[PDB]
Subunit: 144 residues, 3 copies
Amino acid sequence: MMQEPLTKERLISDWNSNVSVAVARTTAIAKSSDASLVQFLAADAAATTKSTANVLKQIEPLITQPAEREILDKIMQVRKTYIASRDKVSQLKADGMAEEAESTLINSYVPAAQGYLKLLGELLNLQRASLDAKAAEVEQIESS
Amino acid sequence: MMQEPLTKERLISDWNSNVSVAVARTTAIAKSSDASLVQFLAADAAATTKSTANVLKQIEPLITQPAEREILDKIMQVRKTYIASRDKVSQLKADGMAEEAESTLINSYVPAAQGYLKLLGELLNLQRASLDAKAAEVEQIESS
Amino acid sequence: MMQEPLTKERLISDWNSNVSVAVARTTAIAKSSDASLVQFLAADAAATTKSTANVLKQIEPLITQPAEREILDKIMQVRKTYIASRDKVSQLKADGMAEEAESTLINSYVPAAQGYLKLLGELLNLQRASLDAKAAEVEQIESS
């Protein structure tokens, strides 16, 4: 049928929403004074990264047109920065350096995540225009 | 094969279980004294609502018989009440009014969630009877 | 195609990662001094157990060769021990006996979970060797 544009929109939408939960999770890792919860949240981030990477493996072959591939390569670049700083706040907090963890959260993590979110937004909007275009086509074929 | 009654039972069962986690999550949002965790939990509820709404989009077209459609429309009505009060405790807590957040949790949220859970239970039990009926049929066809 | 060895590796990998998040979750249940969060975490474990059991239902029929079935029966045995002690720390903590909850965490839970993780590791590595073997075969057929 026409389930690939649908799947792309669904996956990218979930990706956009998960990043926004992760931003608050990272904030709790930096600011929370409950050590065993910080450990649990860091473990959960360690698993979410795997589920995300699997997702990226899934959508990679589905994004072929120029603008979407430009945005996706841009997200792949910024995501390394994002992970690097997120893991730095996590490692800093686990090592008893909370003031520097919070500092890295404000000076590096939030800007990198903000760029990440902007690129996910642009990707989502582009994919919506693409989805409506594909729909108008599939209807122009099922009709005639 | 006969995977639609199976999928309906699986999805409704997960829905019933997720609501029960959400009830404890909302309780933590009202009662916890860890602000950054409250922020993380509220963000997580914001994403779970999306995943749930997608689910409802999925099962909607699968529920066609009378009793199940009556129960499902009843759940759709009570779910607005549920979300409204859950978001109210969340907004009250984020705005520094914790006593009123806890009060809304006891006076509005728990009753609305209780109704929600009862309707999910009735839906699940009905779907189990339906699943065994469909199974007896599919076996009556694969046999003969 | 050849998506069953792929699915087995994906599911077992996720299983291995989820157990590692659960170990930190159980630790937070024993050590955290935030009662409403402990309640939320226990509810979340109650749902994760269901999602896991569904998974085991899924892979059961997919594991047929001798070594993998030996490892899987071993995991099924150790998982009862694991759940029993995890639920014991959870029930002990909910009942106001935190010192004994932490004690059960060190003396029973961590050893049982460690055995669990070792068996998941052996299963994963075996499934990777199996996946590459199946790949070499499928290529030996698509070629010729």
